[PDB]
Structure formats: C-alpha cells, structure tokens
Coordinates of C-alpha atoms and ligand atoms in Angstrom, one line a residue:
X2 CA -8.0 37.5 17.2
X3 CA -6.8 35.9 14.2
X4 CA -9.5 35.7 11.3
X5 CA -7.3 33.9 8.3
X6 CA -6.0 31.3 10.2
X8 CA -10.2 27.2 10.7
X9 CA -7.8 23.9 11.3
X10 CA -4.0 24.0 13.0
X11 CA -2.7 24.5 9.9
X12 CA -4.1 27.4 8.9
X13 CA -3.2 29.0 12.4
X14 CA 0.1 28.2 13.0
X15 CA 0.5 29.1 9.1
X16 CA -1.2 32.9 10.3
X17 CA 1.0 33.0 13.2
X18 CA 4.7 31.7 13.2
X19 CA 4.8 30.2 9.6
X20 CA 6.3 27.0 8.7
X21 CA 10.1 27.0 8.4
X22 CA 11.6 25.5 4.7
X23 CA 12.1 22.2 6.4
X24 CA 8.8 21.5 7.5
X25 CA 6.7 23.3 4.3
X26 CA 9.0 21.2 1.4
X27 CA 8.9 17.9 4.3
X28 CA 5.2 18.2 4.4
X29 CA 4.6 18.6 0.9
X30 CA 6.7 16.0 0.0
X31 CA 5.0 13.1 2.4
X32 CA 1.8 14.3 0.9
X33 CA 3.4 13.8 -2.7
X34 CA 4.1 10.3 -1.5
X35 CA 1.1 9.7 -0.5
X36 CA -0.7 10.2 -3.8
X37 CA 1.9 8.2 -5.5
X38 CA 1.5 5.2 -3.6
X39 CA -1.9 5.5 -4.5
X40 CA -1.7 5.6 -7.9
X41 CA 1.2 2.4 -7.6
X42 CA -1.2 0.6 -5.9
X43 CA -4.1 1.2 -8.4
X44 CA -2.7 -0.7 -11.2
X45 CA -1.2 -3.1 -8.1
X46 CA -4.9 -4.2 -7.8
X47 CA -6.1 -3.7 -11.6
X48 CA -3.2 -6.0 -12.9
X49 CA -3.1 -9.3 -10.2
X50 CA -6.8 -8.8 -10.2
X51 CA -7.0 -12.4 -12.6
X52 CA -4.4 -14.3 -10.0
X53 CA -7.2 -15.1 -7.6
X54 CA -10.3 -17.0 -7.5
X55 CA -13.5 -15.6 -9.1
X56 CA -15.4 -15.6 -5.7
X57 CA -13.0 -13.2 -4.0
X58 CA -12.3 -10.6 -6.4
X59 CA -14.6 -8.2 -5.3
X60 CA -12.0 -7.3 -2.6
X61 CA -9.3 -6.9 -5.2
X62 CA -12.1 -5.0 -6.4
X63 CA -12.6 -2.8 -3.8
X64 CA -9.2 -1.8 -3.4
X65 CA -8.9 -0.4 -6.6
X66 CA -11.9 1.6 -6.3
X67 CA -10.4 2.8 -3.1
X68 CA -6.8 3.6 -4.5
X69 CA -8.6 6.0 -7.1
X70 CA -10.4 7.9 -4.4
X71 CA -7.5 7.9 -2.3
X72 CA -5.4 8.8 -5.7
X73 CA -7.4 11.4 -6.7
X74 CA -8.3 13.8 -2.9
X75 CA -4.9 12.7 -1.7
X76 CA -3.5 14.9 -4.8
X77 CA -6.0 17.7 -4.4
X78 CA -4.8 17.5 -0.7
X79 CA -1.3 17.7 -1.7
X80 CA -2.0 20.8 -4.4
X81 CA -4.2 22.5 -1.3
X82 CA -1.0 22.2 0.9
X83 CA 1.7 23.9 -1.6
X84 CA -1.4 26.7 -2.9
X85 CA -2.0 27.6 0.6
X86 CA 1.5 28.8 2.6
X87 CA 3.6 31.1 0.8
X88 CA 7.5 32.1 1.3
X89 CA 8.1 35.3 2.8
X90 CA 11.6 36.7 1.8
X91 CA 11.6 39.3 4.5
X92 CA 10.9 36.5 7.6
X93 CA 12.7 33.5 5.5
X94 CA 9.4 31.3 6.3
X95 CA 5.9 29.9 4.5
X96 CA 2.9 32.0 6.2
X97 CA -0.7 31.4 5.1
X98 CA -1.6 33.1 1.3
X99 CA -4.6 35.1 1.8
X100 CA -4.6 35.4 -1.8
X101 CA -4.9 31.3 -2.2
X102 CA -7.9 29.0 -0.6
X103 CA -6.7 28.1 2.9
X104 CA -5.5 24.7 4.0
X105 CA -8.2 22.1 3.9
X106 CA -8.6 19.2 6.0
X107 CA -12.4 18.6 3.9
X108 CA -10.0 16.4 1.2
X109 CA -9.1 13.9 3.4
X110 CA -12.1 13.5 5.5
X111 CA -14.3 13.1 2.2
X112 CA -11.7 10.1 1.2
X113 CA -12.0 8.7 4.8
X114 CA -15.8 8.9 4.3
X115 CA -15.4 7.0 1.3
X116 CA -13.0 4.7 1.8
X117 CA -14.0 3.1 5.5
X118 CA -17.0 1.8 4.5
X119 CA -15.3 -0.1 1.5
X120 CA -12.2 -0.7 3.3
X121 CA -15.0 -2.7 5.7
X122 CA -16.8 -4.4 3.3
X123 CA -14.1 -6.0 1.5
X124 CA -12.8 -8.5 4.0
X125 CA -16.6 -9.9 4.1
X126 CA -15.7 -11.1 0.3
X127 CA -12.5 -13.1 1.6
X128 CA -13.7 -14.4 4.6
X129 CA -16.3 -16.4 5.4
X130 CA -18.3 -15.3 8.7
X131 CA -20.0 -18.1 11.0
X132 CA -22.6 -17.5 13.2
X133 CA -23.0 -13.7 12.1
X134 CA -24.4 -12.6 9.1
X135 CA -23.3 -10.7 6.4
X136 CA -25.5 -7.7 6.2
X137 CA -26.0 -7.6 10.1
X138 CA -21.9 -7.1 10.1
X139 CA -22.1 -4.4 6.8
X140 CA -24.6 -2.2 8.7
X141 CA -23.0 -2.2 11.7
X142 CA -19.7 -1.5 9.5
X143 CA -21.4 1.4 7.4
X144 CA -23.6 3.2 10.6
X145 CA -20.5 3.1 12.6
X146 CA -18.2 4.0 9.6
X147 CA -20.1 6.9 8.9
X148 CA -20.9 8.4 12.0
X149 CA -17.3 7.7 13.2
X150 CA -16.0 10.1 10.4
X151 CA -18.9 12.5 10.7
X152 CA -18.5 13.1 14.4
X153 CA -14.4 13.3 13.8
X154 CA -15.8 15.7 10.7
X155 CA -17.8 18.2 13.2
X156 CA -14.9 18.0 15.9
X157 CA -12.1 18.9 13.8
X158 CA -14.0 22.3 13.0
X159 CA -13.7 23.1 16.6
X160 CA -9.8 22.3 16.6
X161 CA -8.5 25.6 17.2
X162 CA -11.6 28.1 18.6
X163 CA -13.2 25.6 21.3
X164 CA -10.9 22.4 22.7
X165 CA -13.5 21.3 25.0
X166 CA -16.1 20.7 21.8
X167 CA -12.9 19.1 19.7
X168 CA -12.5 16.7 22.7
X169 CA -15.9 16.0 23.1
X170 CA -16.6 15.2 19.8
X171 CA -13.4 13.0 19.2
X172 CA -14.4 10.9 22.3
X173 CA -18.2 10.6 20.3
X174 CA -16.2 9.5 17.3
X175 CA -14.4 7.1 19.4
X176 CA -16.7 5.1 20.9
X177 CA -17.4 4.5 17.0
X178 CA -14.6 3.2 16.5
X179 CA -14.2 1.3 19.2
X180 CA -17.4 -0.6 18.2
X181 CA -15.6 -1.3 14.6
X182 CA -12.7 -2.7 16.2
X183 CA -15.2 -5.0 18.4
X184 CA -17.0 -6.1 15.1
X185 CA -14.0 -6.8 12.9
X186 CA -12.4 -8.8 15.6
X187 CA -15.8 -11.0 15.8
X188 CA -15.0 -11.0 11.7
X189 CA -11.3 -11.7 12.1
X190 CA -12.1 -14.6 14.5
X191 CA -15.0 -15.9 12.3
X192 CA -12.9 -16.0 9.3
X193 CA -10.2 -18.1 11.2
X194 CA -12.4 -20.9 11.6
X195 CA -12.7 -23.4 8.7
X196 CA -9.3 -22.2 6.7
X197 CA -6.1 -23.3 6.7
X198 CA -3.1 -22.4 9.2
X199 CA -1.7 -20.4 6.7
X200 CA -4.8 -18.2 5.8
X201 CA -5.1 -17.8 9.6
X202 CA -1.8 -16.5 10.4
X203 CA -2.5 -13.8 7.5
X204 CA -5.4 -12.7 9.2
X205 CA -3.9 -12.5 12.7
X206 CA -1.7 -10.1 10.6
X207 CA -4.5 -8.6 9.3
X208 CA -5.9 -8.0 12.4
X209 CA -2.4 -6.4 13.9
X210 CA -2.2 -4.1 10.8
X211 CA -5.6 -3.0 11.5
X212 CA -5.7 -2.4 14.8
X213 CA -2.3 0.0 14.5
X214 CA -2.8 1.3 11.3
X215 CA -6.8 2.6 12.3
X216 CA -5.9 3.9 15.1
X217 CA -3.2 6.2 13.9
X218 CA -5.7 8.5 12.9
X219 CA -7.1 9.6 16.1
X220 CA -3.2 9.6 16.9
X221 CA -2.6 11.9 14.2
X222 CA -6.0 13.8 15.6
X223 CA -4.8 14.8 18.7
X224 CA -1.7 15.1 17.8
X225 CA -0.8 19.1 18.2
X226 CA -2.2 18.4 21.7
X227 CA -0.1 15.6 23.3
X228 CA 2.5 17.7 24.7
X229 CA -0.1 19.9 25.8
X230 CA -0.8 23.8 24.7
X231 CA 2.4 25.3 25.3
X232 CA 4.7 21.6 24.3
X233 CA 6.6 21.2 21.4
X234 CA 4.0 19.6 19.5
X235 CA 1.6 22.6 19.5
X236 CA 3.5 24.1 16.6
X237 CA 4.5 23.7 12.5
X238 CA 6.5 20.1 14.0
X239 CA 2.8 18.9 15.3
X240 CA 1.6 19.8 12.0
X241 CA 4.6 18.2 10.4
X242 CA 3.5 14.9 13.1
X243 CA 0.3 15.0 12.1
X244 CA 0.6 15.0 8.2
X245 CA 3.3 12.0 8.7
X246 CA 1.1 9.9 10.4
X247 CA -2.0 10.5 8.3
X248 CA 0.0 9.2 5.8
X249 CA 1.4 6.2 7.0
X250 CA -1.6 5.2 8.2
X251 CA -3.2 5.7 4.9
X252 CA -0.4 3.4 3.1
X253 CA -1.2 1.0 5.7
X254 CA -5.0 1.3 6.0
X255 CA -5.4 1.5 2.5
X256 CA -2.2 -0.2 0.2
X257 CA -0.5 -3.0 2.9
X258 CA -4.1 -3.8 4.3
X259 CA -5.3 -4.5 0.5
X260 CA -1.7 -6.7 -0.2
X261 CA -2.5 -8.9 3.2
X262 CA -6.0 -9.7 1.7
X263 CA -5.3 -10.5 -1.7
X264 CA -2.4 -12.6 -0.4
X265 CA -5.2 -13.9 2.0
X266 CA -7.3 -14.8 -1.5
X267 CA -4.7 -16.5 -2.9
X268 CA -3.8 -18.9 0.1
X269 CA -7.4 -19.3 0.0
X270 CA -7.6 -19.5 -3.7
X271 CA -6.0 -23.1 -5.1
X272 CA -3.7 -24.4 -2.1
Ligands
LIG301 C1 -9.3 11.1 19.6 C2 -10.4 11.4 20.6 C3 -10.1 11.1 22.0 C4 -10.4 12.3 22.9 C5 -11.0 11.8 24.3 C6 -10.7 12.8 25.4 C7 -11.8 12.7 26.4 C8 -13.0 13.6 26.0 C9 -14.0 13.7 27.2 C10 -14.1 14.8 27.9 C11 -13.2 16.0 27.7 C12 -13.2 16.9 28.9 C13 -13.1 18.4 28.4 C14 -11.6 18.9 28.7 C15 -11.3 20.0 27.7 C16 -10.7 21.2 28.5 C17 -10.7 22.5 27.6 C18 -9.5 23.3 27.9 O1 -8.8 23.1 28.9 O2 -9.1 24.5 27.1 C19 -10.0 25.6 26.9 C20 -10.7 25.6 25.6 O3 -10.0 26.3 24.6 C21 -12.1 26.1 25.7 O4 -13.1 25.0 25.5
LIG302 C1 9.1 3.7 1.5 C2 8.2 4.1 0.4 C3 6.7 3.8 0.8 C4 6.3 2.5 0.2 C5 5.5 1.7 1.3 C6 5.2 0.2 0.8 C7 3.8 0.1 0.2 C8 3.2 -1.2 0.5 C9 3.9 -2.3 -0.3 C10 4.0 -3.5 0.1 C11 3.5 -4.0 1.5 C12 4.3 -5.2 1.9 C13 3.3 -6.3 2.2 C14 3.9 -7.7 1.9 C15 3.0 -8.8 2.5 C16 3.4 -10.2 1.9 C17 2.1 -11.1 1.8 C18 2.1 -12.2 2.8 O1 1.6 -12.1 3.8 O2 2.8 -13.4 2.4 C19 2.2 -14.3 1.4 C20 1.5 -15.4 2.0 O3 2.3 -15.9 3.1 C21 1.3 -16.5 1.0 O4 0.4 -16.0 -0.1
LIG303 C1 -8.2 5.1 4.5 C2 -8.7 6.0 5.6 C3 -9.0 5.4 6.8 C4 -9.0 4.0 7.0 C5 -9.5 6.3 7.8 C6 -9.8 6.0 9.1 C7 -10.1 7.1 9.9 C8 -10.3 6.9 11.3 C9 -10.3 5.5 11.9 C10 -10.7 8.1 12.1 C11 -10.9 8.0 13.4 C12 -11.2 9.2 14.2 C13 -11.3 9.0 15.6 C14 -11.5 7.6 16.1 C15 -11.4 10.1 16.6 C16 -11.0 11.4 16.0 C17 -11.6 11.6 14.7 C18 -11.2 10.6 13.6 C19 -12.2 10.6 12.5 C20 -9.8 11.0 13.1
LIG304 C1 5.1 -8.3 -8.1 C2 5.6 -7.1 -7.2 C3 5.6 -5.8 -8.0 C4 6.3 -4.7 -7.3 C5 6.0 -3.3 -7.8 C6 7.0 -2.3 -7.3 C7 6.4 -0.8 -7.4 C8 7.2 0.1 -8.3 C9 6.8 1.5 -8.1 C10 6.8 2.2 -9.5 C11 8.0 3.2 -9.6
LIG305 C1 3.2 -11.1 -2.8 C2 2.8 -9.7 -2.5 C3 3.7 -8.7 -3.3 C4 3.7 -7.3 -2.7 C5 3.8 -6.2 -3.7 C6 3.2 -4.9 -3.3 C7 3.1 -3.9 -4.4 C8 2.3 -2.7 -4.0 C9 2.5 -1.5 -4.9 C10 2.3 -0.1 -4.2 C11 3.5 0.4 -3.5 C12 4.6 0.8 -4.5 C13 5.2 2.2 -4.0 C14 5.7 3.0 -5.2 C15 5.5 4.5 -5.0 C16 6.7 5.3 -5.5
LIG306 C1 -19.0 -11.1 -4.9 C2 -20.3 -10.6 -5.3 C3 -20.2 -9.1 -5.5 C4 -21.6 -8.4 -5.6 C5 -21.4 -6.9 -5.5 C6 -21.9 -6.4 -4.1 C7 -21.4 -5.0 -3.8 C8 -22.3 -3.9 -4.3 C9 -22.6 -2.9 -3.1 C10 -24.0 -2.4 -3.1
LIG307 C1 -15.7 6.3 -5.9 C2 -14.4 6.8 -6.5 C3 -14.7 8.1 -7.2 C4 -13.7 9.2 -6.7 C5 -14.3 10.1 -5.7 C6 -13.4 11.3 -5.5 C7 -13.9 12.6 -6.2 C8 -12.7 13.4 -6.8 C9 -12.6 14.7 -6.2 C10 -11.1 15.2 -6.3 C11 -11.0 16.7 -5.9 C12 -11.2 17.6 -7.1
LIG308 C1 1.0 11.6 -10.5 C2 0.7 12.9 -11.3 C3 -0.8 13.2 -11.3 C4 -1.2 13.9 -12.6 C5 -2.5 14.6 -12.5 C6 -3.5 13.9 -11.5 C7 -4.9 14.4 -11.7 C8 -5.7 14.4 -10.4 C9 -6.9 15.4 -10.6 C10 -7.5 15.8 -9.2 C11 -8.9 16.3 -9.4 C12 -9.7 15.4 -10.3 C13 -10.9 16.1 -11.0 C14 -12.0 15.1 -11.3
LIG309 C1 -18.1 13.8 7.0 C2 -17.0 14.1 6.0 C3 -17.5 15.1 5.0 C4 -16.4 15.9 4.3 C5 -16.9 16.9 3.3 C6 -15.9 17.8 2.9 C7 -16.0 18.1 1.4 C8 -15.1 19.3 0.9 C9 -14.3 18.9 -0.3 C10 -13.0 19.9 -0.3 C11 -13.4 21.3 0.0 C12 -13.1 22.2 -1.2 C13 -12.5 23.5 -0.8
LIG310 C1 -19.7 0.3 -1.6 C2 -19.6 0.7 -0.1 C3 -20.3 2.1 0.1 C4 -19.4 3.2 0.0 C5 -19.8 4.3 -1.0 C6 -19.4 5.7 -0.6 C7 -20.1 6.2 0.6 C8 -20.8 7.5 0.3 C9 -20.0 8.8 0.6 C10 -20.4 10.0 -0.2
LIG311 C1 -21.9 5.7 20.8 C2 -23.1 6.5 21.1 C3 -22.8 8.0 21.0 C4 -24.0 8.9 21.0 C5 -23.8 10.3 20.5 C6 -24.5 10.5 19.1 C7 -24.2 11.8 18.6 C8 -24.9 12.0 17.2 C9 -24.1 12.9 16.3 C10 -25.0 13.8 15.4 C11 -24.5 13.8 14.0 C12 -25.2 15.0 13.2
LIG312 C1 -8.0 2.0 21.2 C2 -6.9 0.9 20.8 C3 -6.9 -0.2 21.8 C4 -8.2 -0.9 22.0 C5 -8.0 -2.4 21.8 C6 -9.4 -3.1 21.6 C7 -9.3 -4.5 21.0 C8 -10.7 -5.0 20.6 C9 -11.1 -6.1 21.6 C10 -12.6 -6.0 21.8 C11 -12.9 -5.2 23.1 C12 -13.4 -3.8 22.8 C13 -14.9 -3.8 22.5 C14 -15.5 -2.4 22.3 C15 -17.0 -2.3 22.6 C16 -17.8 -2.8 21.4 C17 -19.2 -2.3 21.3 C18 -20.2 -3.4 21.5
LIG313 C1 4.1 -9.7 14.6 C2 3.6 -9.7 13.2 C3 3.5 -8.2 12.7 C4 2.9 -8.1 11.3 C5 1.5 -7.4 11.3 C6 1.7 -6.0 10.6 C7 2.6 -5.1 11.4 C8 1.9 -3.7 11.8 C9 2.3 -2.7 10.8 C10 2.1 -1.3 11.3 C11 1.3 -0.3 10.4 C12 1.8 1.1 10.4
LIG314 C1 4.8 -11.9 7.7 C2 4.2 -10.9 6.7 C3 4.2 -9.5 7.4 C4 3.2 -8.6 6.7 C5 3.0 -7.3 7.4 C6 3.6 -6.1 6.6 C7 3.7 -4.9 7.4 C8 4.8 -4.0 6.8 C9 5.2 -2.9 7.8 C10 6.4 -2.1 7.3
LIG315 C1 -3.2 -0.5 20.7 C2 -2.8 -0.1 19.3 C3 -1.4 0.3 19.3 C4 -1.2 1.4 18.2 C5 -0.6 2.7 18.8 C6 -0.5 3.8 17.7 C7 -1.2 5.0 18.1 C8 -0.2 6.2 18.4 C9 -0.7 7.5 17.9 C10 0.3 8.2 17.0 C11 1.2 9.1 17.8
LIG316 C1 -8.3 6.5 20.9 C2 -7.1 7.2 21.4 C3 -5.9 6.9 20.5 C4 -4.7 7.9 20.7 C5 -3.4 7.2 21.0 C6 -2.2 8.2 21.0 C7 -1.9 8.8 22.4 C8 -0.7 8.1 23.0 C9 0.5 9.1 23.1 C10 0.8 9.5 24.5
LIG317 NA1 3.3 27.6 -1.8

C-alpha cells in the first residue's frame, strides 16, 4: 500500500515518476498560467477608465479575480517543482518525501473564490428582465459554492475509493448543470433591449462559457477516460489534466473578462 503517494499526482509521483518531459512541461504550463494572470491584472487595472461608470464593477471584478488567480496559481506552480524530485539512478522526478506533497487545495481555494465573482460580474453588464438580481446572485453563490465543495470532497477520494470520487463529481455536477441553466436565463435576458452587436458578444460569451466551464470536470476525470489500465491513467493524464486546468482557467478567467469589457464598451457610448 503506498502511504506518500492523496491526489493522482502524488501516486503516480510514488510509483513510476514523471519522465523530464512531462515534470519541466507541467511546470512550465503552470508558469504560464500565473503569468497570464498577472498580464491580465494590470489588463483590467489600466482600461478600467475606457468604459462607462455603471459597468465598471465587472472590470472590477476581474481584477480582483486575476490577483487571486495570480497569487494560488503561483503557489500552485512552486507546490509542483517543490514536490517531485530527479532521481539520477532512474533518470525520472519521483515524489520528495522531504518536500510537502503535490496539492490540489491551491486551485480549489482560487475556484472557490473566483466562481462566485466570475458570476456576479456579468449581472453589472447586463441588464436582467423578468428575473431579479439577487434571486440570480443566490442561486449563482449556493450553487457556486456547493459545486466546488462537493468537487472539493470527491477529489480526496481520487485515488483510494473511485466509487465515492464518482459519486461526488456527479453531486457537483448537477451544480453545475443548474449554473449553466441560470446563466443561459442571464445570457438570454441580457440579449433583450441591446444592440445586435452587444448580442453577438454575449452569444460568444455564452459559447466561451459553456466550453471553457466545463473543461474542469473534463480535466477531473481526466486520468479516468481511458479507463484504469489506458494511457491516460499515468504521468500523460497528469500532464492532460494540468493542460486543461489551465486553459480553461485563461479562458474562464482572462478571455471571459476581455468579452465583457468589450461587451461594456459596445454598451458604453455607441
Ligand atoms: C465530473 C463528474 C461526472 C461523473 C459522473 C459519473 C456517474 C456517477 C454516478 C454513479 C457512479 C457509479 C459508481 C461506479 C464506480 C465503480 C467503482 C470501480 O469500478 O472501481 C473500484 C473502486 O476503486 C472502489 O470503489
Ligand atoms: C499563447 C499564450 C497564452 C495567451 C492566451 C491569450 C490570453 C487572452 C488574451 C486575449 C483574448 C482574445 C479576446 C479578443 C476578443 C475581442 C473582443 C471582441 O469581441 O470584439 C470587440 C467588439 O466587437 C467591439 O467592442
Ligand atoms: C476560474 C475557475 C473556475 C471558473 C472554475 C470552475 C470550476 C468548475 C466549473 C468545476 C466543476 C466540477 C465539476 C462540475 C465536477 C467535478 C468537480 C469540479 C469542481 C471540477
Ligand atoms: C491593447 C492591447 C494590449 C495587448 C497586451 C499584450 C500583452 C503583453 C504581455 C507582456 C509581456
Ligand atoms: C479589444 C480587446 C483587446 C484584447 C487584449 C487582451 C489583453 C489581455 C492580456 C492578458 C494576456 C497576455 C498574455 C501575456 C503572458 C505572457
Ligand atoms: C455597480 C455597483 C457596485 C456595488 C458593489 C456591490 C458588490 C459588493 C458585494 C457584496
Ligand atoms: C480576494 C483576493 C485575495 C487573494 C486571496 C488568495 C490568498 C493568497 C494565498 C496564496 C498562497 C500563499
Ligand atoms: C512573476 C514572478 C512572481 C514574483 C513573486 C510572486 C509572489 C507571489 C506570492 C505567493 C504567496 C503570497 C503570500 C501572501
Ligand atoms: C472547497 C474548497 C476548499 C479548498 C481549501 C484548501 C485550502 C488549502 C490551501 C493550500 C494547502 C496548503 C498546503
Ligand atoms: C464578491 C463575491 C463573493 C466572493 C467572495 C469569496 C468567497 C469566500 C471564499 C473564502
Ligand atoms: C442537486 C442536489 C444534490 C443533493 C446532494 C447534496 C449533498 C450535500 C453535500 C454536503 C456538503 C458538506
Ligand atoms: C454538460 C455540458 C452540456 C450541457 C448543455 C446544457 C445547456 C444549457 C441548456 C439548459 C438546459 C439544462 C438545464 C439544467 C437544469 C437546471 C436546473 C433547474
Ligand atoms: C463561433 C464563435 C466562437 C467564439 C466563442 C468563443 C470560442 C470558444 C473558446 C474555447 C475556450 C477554450
Ligand atoms: C469574434 C470574437 C471571438 C472572441 C472569442 C475569443 C476566443 C479565443 C479562443 C482562442
Ligand atoms: C458541450 C460543451 C462542449 C465542451 C467540451 C469540452 C469538454 C472536454 C473535456 C476535456 C477532455
Ligand atoms: C459533466 C461531464 C463533462 C465531461 C466531458 C469530458 C468527457 C468526454 C471525453 C470522452
Ligand atoms: Na523539483
């Protein structure tokens, strides 16, 4: 029974290491990651003035969500290079018992963060119609929340008990299902009363957010889509995994952000 080796990482880091390749190709998508982040940051701080007053709390928004996203995707990035070590005598990166273990609590704290505000923000660029505000926040932050709490409890489960990973991930997505049902109602809303061009942004809001979201459970299940004994149950799942996390993070987080302040603006003087 292997003790050291939590999460997927962790194991196949305890059990057949991660060749050069996939350690330095991992580390370096989650470098990427954090600089995005930190590009986007001042993105939002500095256009901030180029739309109207009454939308800027999504411009807003973004930027508090590029600093979180800044600041846990670097600790995620530093938890990934401190945790697997090179082995001279196999010639690949095993699990450091000597360093703090691979930790998936970084990104889940962002997600946690950030979904909720992610959320909220459109609600400041669009105008709803026949739905209110704060009925469509709560149902935004309750699902938000228990969507990434339930994904939270799951992942723990990832290795030692499949059934109770499963399980869980299916709780998480009928969350998430319901988010997608209420930021369609949104999406459609905030179509009605703006101009053509402000609705074909948000149809490309929508597209980007119905990809980009569901990514994540992609990237969830990911070591498991080939099955237990397929080629994705293995350092190139984990290698998968990390890829798409952060694409969809970039797109969730950075592109998402661009549409709607470009949304603002089309909304703003023309
Ligand atoms: C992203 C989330 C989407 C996931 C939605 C999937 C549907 C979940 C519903 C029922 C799962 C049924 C349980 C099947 C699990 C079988 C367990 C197994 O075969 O492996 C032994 C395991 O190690 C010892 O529990
Ligand atoms: C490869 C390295 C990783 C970097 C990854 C890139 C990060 C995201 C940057 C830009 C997103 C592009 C979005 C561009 C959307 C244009 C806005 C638009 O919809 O058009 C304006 C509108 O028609 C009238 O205001
Ligand atoms: C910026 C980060 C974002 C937008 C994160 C979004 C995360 C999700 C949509 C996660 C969804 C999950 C499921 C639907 C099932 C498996 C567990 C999760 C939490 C990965
Ligand atoms: C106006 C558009 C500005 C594009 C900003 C390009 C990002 C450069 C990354 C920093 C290196
Ligand atoms: C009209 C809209 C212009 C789009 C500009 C988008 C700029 C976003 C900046 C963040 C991405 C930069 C990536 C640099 C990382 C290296
Ligand atoms: C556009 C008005 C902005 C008011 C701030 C509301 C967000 C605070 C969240 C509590
Ligand atoms: C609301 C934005 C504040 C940032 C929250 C992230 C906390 C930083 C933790 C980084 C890990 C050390
Ligand atoms: C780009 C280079 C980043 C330089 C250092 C980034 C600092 C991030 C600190 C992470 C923990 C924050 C503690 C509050
Ligand atoms: C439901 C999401 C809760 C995530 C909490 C994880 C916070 C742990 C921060 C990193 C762990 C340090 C080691
Ligand atoms: C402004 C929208 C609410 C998000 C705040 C962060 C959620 C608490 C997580 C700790
Ligand atoms: C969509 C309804 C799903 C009902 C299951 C609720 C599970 C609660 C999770 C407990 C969190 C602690
Ligand atoms: C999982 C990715 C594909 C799903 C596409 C769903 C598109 C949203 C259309 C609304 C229908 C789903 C509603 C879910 C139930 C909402 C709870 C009330
Ligand atoms: C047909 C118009 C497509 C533009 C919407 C955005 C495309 C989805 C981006 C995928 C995110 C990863
Ligand atoms: C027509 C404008 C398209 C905006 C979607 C951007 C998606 C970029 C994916 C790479
Ligand atoms: C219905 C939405 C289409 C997006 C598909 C992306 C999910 C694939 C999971 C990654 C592998
Ligand atoms: C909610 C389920 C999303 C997972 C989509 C990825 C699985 C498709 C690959 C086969
Ligand atoms: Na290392």
């Amino acid at each position: 029974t292997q003790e050291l080796g939590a999460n997927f990482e962790n194991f196949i880091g305890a059990t057949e290491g991660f060749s050069e390749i996939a350690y330095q190709f991992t580390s370096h998508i989650l470098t990427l990651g954090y600089a995005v982040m930190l590009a986007g940051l001042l993105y939002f701080i500095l256009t901030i003035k180029n739309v109207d007053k009454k939308f800027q709390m999504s411009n807003i928004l973004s930027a508090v969500v590029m600093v979180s996203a800044f600041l846990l995707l670097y600790a995620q990035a530093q938890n990934w290079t401190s945790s697997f070590t090179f082995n001279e005598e196999v010639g690949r990166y095993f699990l450091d018992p000597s360093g703090d273990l691979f930790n998936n609590g970084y990104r889940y704290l962002n997600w946690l963060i950030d979904v909720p505000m992610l959320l909220f923000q459109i609600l400041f660029v669009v105008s709803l119609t026949t739905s209110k505000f704060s009925s469509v926040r709560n149902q935004f932050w309750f699902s938000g929340a228990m969507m990434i709490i339930t994904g939270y409890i799951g992942q723990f489960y990832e290795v030692s008990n499949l059934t109770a990973f499963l399980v869980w991930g299916a709780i998480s997505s009928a969350f998430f299902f319901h988010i997608l049902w209420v930021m369609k109602k949104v999406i459609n809303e905030g179509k009605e009363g703006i101009s053509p061009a402000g609705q074909k942004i948000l149809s490309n809001i929508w597209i980007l957010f119905l990809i980009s979201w569901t990514l994540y459970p992609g990237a969830y299940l990911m070591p498991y889509l080939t099955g237990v004994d397929g080629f994705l149950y293995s350092e190139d799942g984990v290698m998968a995994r990390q890829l798409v996390y952060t694409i969809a993070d970039v797109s969730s987080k950075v592109i998402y952000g661009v549409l709607l302040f470009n949304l603002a603006i089309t909304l703003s003087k023309n």
